[PDB]
Ligand binder design. Sequence first.
Ligand code: CLA
Ligand code: CLA
Ligand code: CLA
Ligand code: CLA
Ligand code: CLA
Ligand code: CLA
Ligand SMILES: CC1=C(/C=C/C(C)=C/C=C/C(C)=C/C=C/C=C(C)/C=C/C=C(C)/C=C/C2=C(C)CCCC2(C)C)C(C)(C)CCC1
Ligand SMILES: CC1=C(/C=C/C(C)=C/C=C/C(C)=C/C=C/C=C(C)/C=C/C=C(C)/C=C/C2=C(C)CCCC2(C)C)C(C)(C)CCC1
Ligand SMILES: CCCCCCCCCCCCCCCCCC(=O)O
Ligand SMILES: [Fe+2]
Lengths: 82, 65, 341, 33, 32, 30, 37, 38, 57, 34, 115, 505, 34
Amino acid sequence: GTTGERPFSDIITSVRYWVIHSITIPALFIAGWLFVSTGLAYDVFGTPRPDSYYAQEQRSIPLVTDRFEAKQQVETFLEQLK
Amino acid sequence: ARRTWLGDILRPLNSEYGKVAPGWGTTPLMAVFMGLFLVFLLIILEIYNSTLILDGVNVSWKALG
Amino acid sequence: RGWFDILDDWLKRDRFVFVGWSGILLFPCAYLALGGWLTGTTFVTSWYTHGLASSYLEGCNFLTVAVSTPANSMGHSLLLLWGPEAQGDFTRWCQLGGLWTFIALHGAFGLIGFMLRQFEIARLVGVRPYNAIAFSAPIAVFVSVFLIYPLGQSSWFFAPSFGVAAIFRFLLFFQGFHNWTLNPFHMMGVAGVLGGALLCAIHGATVENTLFQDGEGASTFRAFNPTQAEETYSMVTANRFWSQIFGIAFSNKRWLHFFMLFVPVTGLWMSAIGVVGLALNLRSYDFISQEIRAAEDPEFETFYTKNLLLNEGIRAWMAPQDQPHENFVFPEEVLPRGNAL
Amino acid sequence: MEVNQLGLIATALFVLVPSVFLIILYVQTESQQ
Amino acid sequence: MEVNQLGLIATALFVLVPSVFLIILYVQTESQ
Amino acid sequence: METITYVFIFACIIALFFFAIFFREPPRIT
Amino acid sequence: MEPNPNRQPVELNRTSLYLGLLLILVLALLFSSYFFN
Amino acid sequence: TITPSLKGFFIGLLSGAVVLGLTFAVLIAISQIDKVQR
Amino acid sequence: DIDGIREPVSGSLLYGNNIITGAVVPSSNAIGLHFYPIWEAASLDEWLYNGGPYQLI
Amino acid sequence: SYPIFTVRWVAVHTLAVPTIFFLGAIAAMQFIQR
Amino acid sequence: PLGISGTFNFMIVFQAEHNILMHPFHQLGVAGVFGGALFCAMHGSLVTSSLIRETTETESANYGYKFGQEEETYNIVAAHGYFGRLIFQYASFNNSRSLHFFLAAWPVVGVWFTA
Amino acid sequence: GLPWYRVHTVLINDPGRLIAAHLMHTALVAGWAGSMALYELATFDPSDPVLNPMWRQGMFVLPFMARLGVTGSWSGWSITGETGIDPGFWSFEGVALAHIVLSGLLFLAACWHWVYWDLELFRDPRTGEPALDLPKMFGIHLFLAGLLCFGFGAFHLTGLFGPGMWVSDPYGLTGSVQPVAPEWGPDGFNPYNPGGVVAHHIAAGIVGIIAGLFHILVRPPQRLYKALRMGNIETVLSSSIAAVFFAAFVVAGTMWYGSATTPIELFGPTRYQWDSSYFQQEINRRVQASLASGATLEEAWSAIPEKLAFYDYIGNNPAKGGLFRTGPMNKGDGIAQAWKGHAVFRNKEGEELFVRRMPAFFESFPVILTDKNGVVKADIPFRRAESKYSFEQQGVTVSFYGGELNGQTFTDPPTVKSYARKAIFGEIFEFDTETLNSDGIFRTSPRGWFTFAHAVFALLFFFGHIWHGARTLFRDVFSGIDPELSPEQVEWGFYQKVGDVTTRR
Amino acid sequence: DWRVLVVLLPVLLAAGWAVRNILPYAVKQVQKLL
Ligand code: CLA
Ligand code: CLA
Ligand code: CLA
Ligand code: CLA
Ligand code: CLA
Ligand code: CLA
Ligand SMILES: CC1=C(/C=C/C(C)=C/C=C/C(C)=C/C=C/C=C(C)/C=C/C=C(C)/C=C/C2=C(C)CCCC2(C)C)C(C)(C)CCC1
Ligand SMILES: CC1=C(/C=C/C(C)=C/C=C/C(C)=C/C=C/C=C(C)/C=C/C=C(C)/C=C/C2=C(C)CCCC2(C)C)C(C)(C)CCC1
Ligand SMILES: CCCCCCCCCCCCCCCCCC(=O)O
Ligand SMILES: [Fe+2]
C-alpha cells in the first residue's frame, strides 16, 4: 500500500524540513509581495494603474476595434495617458 | 462453404489473414508521413483562420473575382 | 527491448502520482490551463476587450475576477502569442485576451489527456473502461459551450469567460437572448443533473440505513473490510422498504449502478445538443400559436408571455454595457419599463 | 389555437412506433419462457 | 386539393393498429 | 385536439404506474 | 448448405418494457408542445 | 513571399519542436538510468 | 388574477395553454397571506377567479 | 532508505512554489489605495 | 407557480430582487447538485467498471447478479486500485460504508443550504 | 437472450450477412435521395430565381444536384431561369429515377447475399473459419477511392469529360455551372478558390492510388497489428467513426462560414455577410459610383439589381430562425415579390438619418435613427411622457429611391414609423403572405439546417468512436473482470510497473 | 530593470539555502542509483 516515497507525515514533522522551508516559504512570499509593491506586475501584464484607466477628461473605453492593428490601437491608447 | 466462379477469382485477395511484418516494420516511415500531414493541416487551418497570412491568398468571397 | 520499451517501463511505474503515456499530454496542458487562469485572475485586466476590471490586482474579489474573452474584433482568431495580432509581445497578448484561448485550448487538450489517462490506467489495472466512457459527458459540455457555441457566433467574445460572476452573466444572457429555459434539451439536462443528485443521495442513504450489524461499536464504519466477500448491507430489506414506500424498488445491483452512470451522463449529453443549436441561434424561443393569439387578443396572458417581457428587459438593459463594441446608444425613452419601476 | 396541424400525427407516431416495437419484443420473450 | 386533414391520421392508424396486432401475434408464435 | 393529446398521454402514464406497481415482475430471492 | 449458426434469441423483460414505455410517454409529453408549436 | 505571419508560423513550429524534443530527451535519459528490475 | 390588479393570467390547457406554458396560478395579491378556503368565497366562480385552488393544493 | 527528489517532489513544488508567491502578491494588493 | 414556465418566471424575478446567483447558499446548492451528479456518475461507473465476469458476451451482464445473493457482485479493491491511481491512493475510498455515507451527505447538505 | 441494444452483433462473424446488411443500408440511403428529390420537384416553384430561389423554398437536395452540374428539368425549366433547355437524361427527374432504380437493384443483391451467406471466399483457407483480411481490404478500397477521387477531379470538375461545378461572382449574382481549371499555387488552399477544389481531388487522388498500392503490398507491423487489434473488425468501426465525425465537423464549418463548395445562390447567404454588412457595402459602392458619373439619386438606386438588395435583408440571414419554426423561409416572412426601394430618412432640418440595423442576436430591437456621425436624432419611444426624439417632434420623413416606391415620399408619422420598423431588417421588400399563410416569423435557411444537423451528428458520433474503441481495446473484459484477479496486482508497491507481473519486488 | 532582481533575489537565496542543507543527502541518492 506504499510506493516507496517518504511519508508526508514523517517529512513535515522532521527538523530538517522546517530548517529549509522556514526560509524558502517567507522568501517566496516576500518575492511575490515585491512583484506588486515595486509596480512590476503592472508593467509585465499591462494592467492599468488606478490613474490610467481613462485620460483626465475622457469617459470612453479604449476598446480594441481592429484585429490586425489591435496591438497598435492599445499603444495609441497608452500614449494618450501622458 | 459454397464455391463460386467470382469467389475463386477473388480468393487470393482474402488469403493472408493474420500475416504481419516483423517487429516495428514501416512504423518509422509512417510517423514521418504523420508529422508532415499534421504540419500540412496546421497550415490549412491557420490560412482559413487568418492566423497565417500569405501574399496573393485573399481568404474572402472576393477571391471569386 | 529498445528505447521505446524502456520508456514504457518508466512511464508506467507504480508511484505516488501515476504518469503514463497520457501524462505527457495531460500534465503540461492541465497545469498550463490552471496556471493561466490563476495568473489571469490575479494580474490581468479586461479593460481593452470588455471595458471591465477582472483581477485581484485591480480590486476584484474571488467572485468577480475572470479571464475574459477576447474582443469581438478578434473573430475566432487562435490568438497565438506569435500570431499576427500579438506579434510575440506578451504584454499586448494579455491585453488582447490571449489568455482566454490559451486556457480554452490547453484545457481542451488536457481534457483529452485525462480521458486517455482513464483508458490507460483501466487497461493496466484490468478493469472495464466505463469511468472513461462516463467522462465523455463533461467533454461534450466543455466543447459545445466553450468552443462550438462561439464558433457559430461572431467571435470568441460571446463564449463564457472564466470567472464566477462572468458565468453568472452567461446564464442570464442565455435567458434573455436564447430563452434557454424553454429549450427541451436543457430541460432534459436539468432532469439528468437533479436526477443524478437524487440518485446519489437516495442510494447513499439507503445503504447506510440497511447496514448489517457486523461490529459492536456505535460507529458502523469500522465494521467493514475491503476484502470481505459479503454484501455490507441488505439488498432484500432495501428492496422491501422502497417497494412499500414508493411502489417500486431496485432489485438488481448491477442495473442500479449502471442507471447511476446512465442518468447524469445522458442529461449532460442532451444539454450539449441544445447548446449546439444555440450556436446558430436555432433556439426554442417562441410558441407560434401563443404569439398569434396574444397579438390579436390583448386579454390573453400566460406565464409564457410574461417571461418574454422579462427577456426583452434583459436585452435592452444589459446589451450596451455587455456588447460595448456595438456602440448601442439607447436613450431613456426607448427603454422598456413597466409602471413606476 | 392555430397549432401546427402535423403536430398530431407526429405525436401519435412518436408514441406508437417505439411503443409497438417494445411490446413486440416483450410478448415474444414471454412465449419463449 | 382541399382534402379532410384528419384523413391522414385516420388512414395512418387504420393501417398501423391492426397491422401491429397481427405482427405481435406472429412473432410470439415463432418464438414458442 | 392538442388538449385531448396532452391529457391522453398523461392518462397513459398513470395507467402505466398502476401496472408497474401492481403487476411488476415479483422479486424472488436468490 | 447448413442453416446459419450466428442466429440468436432476443429478449426484453417486463421491467425493461415498463422503463421503455415510460421513457417514450414522457418524451412524447415533453416534445408534443413543440410539435404543436 | 515570406510574410511576417509565415515567419511566426515557423517560429511557433520551431518552439514546439524544441519543447517536444527537450521533453522526450529528458524522459528517455531518466528511463535509461532508473530501469525496473526483472 | 395572481397579482390582484384585475389582470387574470390564463393557466390551464382548455384556456389556451400547452404542457410547457400551463400552470395552476398562485392566489391573488389582494388576499396576501389570508386563508382562502372554498367556504370563505361567495361562490366557486369567485374562488376560481382569485386563485383559491393554489392554496388548497 | 528514502529518496529525496521524486516525481512526487516535483509535482508538489510545481504547485506549492507559485502558490506561496501568488499569496504574497495578493497580500500586498490589500494595501493598494486608489 | 405550479407549472413549468411559471417556475422560470419565479426564478427570473427571484434573481432580480435577491441576486441569488451571488448568494453563497445558492452557490453551495449548485455544488451540491453538480457534485451529486458527478458522484452519481463516478460511483456508477466505478462499480460497473469492476463487475466480476459472470456472464457471456451474448447476455446482459446484469444477469450476473441474483436478488439477495450473499457475495458482492463487484471487486471493490480493483475499483480502489483504479481510482487511487487515477488521482492518488489516499483520494480514493476503500471503505464502502464511508463512501456511501459521503454519497448521501454531499447533495443532502448542499440542498439544505440552498433551501 | 440478446438484449435489444445488441441484436446486430450477430453479423460480427458473418461477412456474407454483413455485406447483406450493408447493401440494405445502401439501398435505403439511395432510395431516400430519390424520394427526397421527387418531393422537392413536386413542390419547387422555378419561376423566380431572383426573389424566390431554391433556398427560400426549403430545398435541401436540389442545391446538391445543382452544385455538380444538374440544372434542368425534363419540363423545360432550368434553375438559372433559362427556358427551353433540353437537359438530356441527367435532369433532376432522371437523377431521381436513377437513385430509385439503384435502390431496387441493391435490395435484390441484399437478398441474395443474405440467403447465400456461406461463401468459400469468406473462409480462412488454413483454418476454415470465417476471416476477413482487413489490412489488404483497406488497400484495395483505398486504391479504389483514389481512382474515383482522381477521376472526379480530373474529368468531372475540369469539364474534360463532365459538366464542371457551380461557380459564381463574389456577390452571388451570376452563378452557373462552369468547368474549373486547377489552382496549383498556394491560393489552392484558399477555401474560396474553386480551382483549389479541382487540384485537391487530382493530387489527393494520386496519393490515394499510391497509398492504396502500398497497403495492398505491405503487411502491417506486428507491433501495430497487436496494438490496434487489426484482427478485430471492430477496430475498423472505431477508426471509421472517428474519420466520419472529423469529416462531419469540417462540412458543418464550411457550410456555416462559407466556401467555394457552399455557394450562396444554392444555400443562401451566411450570417457573417450580415455581421460585416457585406452586401450593403457593395450596394453603397455602386450608388456612389453612379453618383460620381452624374446619375441622380433615383437613377443610381434604380440601377441596383433586386437580387443584390435581397441579400441585404436580415430575413435571409441563417441565424434568425428557431428550432421548431418548421418549413421554408417563405412560410415566415412570405414569398418575396418586389423590392420596395431604398428608404431615406430625414428630420425636419433635412439631415439624412440612418436606422440602426438589427443584430442577429436580437429577437426584437428598438427603432433608433442616427446621423452620419452616430448621434441619436430620432427614435420610437416606449415611455411617451418624457420623449425627446419622437418622429412627431423631429418631423422625420421617408423617401424611396429605386424599386417599387421610387420617387415617393411619406410624411405622415405612422406611415414613416412603419417603414422605419422594416428598415431595421435591411432593404425593404413586398411579401406575399397569403399564398402560404405565412405567420411573419423568421425561419432559417438550408445552410442553417444543414449545419445544425451535421454538427449534432458529429458530436454524437464522437461518443460512438469512444464506445467502439473501448470495446476493441477491452474486448477481453467486456463481460466483467477476472474473478481471480490478484489483490496484489491492484494494490500499491507489489509490482514496480503497473500491471506487469514480471516486475514483482 | 532593477525591480526584476529585487523580486528574484529572495528566491535565489531561498534556493541557495535549500541546496546547502540538502547537498550531502542528494549525493547519496544520485550516485547510489549506480
Ligand atoms: C503536451 C504539451 C503541449 C501541447 C499539446 C500544447 C498545445 C498548444 N499550445 Mg502550449 N505549451 C506547452 C505544452 C503544450 N502546448 C509547454 C510545455 C509550454 C511552455 C514552454 C507551452 C507554452 C505555450 C504558449 C506560450 C502558447 C502555447 C500555445 C499552444 C497552442 C498552439 C501550439 C502550436 O501551434 O504548436 C505548433 C507546433 C507544433 C505542433 C510542433 C510540431 C513539431 C513537429 C514534430 C515538426 C517539427 C519540425 C521542426 C520545425 C524542425 C526544426 C527545424 C530547425 C532545423 C530549424 C496549442 C493548443 C499557444 C496558445 O495557446 O495560443 C492561444 C501559445 O501562445 N503553448
Ligand atoms: C434547476 C436549475 C438548473 C439545473 C439543474 C441546470 C443544469 C444544467 N445547466 Mg442550466 N440554467 C438554469 C438552471 C439550471 N440548469 C437557468 C435558470 C438558466 C438560465 C437560462 C441556465 C443556463 C444555463 C447555461 C447558459 C448553460 C447551462 C448548462 C447546464 C448544464 C451544466 C452541466 C455542467 O455540469 O457543466 C459543468 C461544466 C463541465 C462539466 C465542463 C467540464 C468541466 C471540467 C471537467 C472541469 C475541470 C476543472 C479542473 C479539475 C480544475 C478546476 C479547479 C478550479 C476551480 C481551481 C446542466 C445540464 C450548460 C449546458 O447546457 O451545457 C451544455 C450551459 O452552458 N445552464
Ligand atoms: C496541390 C495540392 C492540394 C491543394 C491545392 C488542396 C486543396 C484543398 N484541400 Mg487537399 N490534400 C492534398 C492536396 C491538395 N489539397 C493532398 C495531397 C492530401 C493528402 C491525400 C490532401 C488532404 C486534404 C484533407 C484531409 C483536407 C484537404 C482540404 C483541402 C481544402 C482546404 C481549404 C478548406 O476548406 O479547408 C477546410 C479544412 C480545414 C481548415 C481543416 C480543419 C481541421 C480541424 C480544425 C481539425 C479538428 C477537428 C476536431 C475533431 C473538431 C472538433 C473540435 C471542434 C468542434 C472545436 C482545399 C480544397 C480540407 C477540406 O477538404 O476542406 C473542405 C481537408 O480537410 N486536403
Ligand atoms: C454511380 C454512383 C453515383 C453517382 C454518380 C451519384 C450522384 C449524385 N448523388 Mg447519389 N448515391 C449513390 C451513388 C451515386 N450518386 C449511392 C450508391 C448512394 C447510397 C449511399 C447515394 C446516395 C445519395 C444521397 C443520400 C444523396 C446523393 C446525392 C447525389 C448528388 C450529389 C453528390 C454529392 O454531393 O456527393 C457528395 C460527395 C461526398 C459525400 C464525398 C465525400 C467523401 C469523403 C470526403 C471521403 C472519405 C474518405 C476517403 C475514403 C479517403 C480517400 C483518401 C484519399 C487519399 C483518396 C449527385 C447527383 C445527393 C442528392 O442531391 O440526392 C438527390 C444526396 O443528398 N446520393
Ligand atoms: C441532415 C438531414 C436533413 C436536413 C438538414 C433537412 C433540412 C430540411 N428539410 Mg428535410 N428531410 C430529411 C433530412 C433532412 N432535411 C429526411 C431524412 C426526411 C424524411 C423524414 C426529410 C423530409 C423532409 C420533408 C417532408 C420536408 C423537409 C423540409 C426541410 C427544410 C425544413 C426543415 C425543418 O423544418 O426542420 C424541422 C426540424 C425539427 C423540428 C427538429 C426535430 C428534431 C427533434 C427535436 C429531435 C428529437 C430528439 C430526441 C427525442 C432525443 C432524445 C434521446 C434520448 C432518449 C437519449 C430543411 C431545408 C421541409 C421543406 O421545406 O421542404 C420543401 C419539408 O416539408 N424535409
Ligand atoms: C457506422 C456506424 C455504426 C455502426 C455500424 C454501429 C454498429 C453497432 N453498434 Mg454502435 N454506435 C454508433 C455508430 C455505429 N454503431 C454511434 C454513432 C454511437 C453513438 C450514438 C454508437 C453507440 C453504440 C452503443 C452504446 C452500443 C452500440 C452497439 C453496436 C452493435 C449493436 C447495435 C445494435 O444492435 O443496435 C440495435 C438498435 C436498435 C434495435 C434500435 C436503435 C434505434 C435508435 C435509438 C434510433 C433509431 C435510428 C433511426 C432508425 C435511423 C437513424 C439514422 C441516422 C443515424 C442517420 C453494432 C456492432 C452496442 C454494442 O456494443 O453491443 C455489443 C451498444 O451497446 N453502438
Ligand atoms: C500563463 C503562462 C504561463 C504559465 C504560468 C503558470 C503555470 C502559472 C502558475 C501559477 C500558479 C500555480 C498559481 C497559484 C496560485 C495559488 C493561489 C492564489 C492559491 C490561493 C489559495 C487560497 C486563497 C485558498 C485558501 C484556503 C481556503 C479558502 C479554504 C481552505 C483552506 C485554504 C488554505 C486552501 C507560462 C509561464 C507558460 C508563460 C505563458 C503564460
Ligand atoms: C424492387 C425493385 C425496384 C423498386 C424499388 C423501389 C421502388 C425503391 C424505393 C425506395 C424508397 C422509396 C426508399 C425510401 C427510403 C426512405 C428512408 C430510408 C427514409 C428514412 C428517414 C429517416 C431515417 C428519418 C429520420 C428522422 C425523422 C423521421 C425525424 C427527424 C429526424 C430524423 C431525420 C432523424 C425497381 C423497380 C427499381 C427495380 C426492380 C426491383
Ligand atoms: C504537439 C505538441 C506541440 C505543442 C508545443 C508547445 C509550443 C511551445 C510554446 C513555446 C512558444 C513560446 C515562445 C514564442 C515566442 C514568440 C515571440 C516572437 O515571435 O517574437
Ligand atoms: Fe453503491
